[PDB]
Amino acid sequence: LVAIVQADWNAPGWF
Incomplete structure (x- = not known):
């Protein structure tokens, strides 16, 4: 749920 x-x-x- 993020960017990395x-x-x-x-x-x-993801991270």
């Missing part, structure tokens, strides 16, 4: 890394599931990122 591909994505957590919905947001443009």
Whole structure:
């Protein structure tokens, strides 16, 4: 749900 890394599931990122 954040920015760093591909994505957590919905947001443009994971971390």
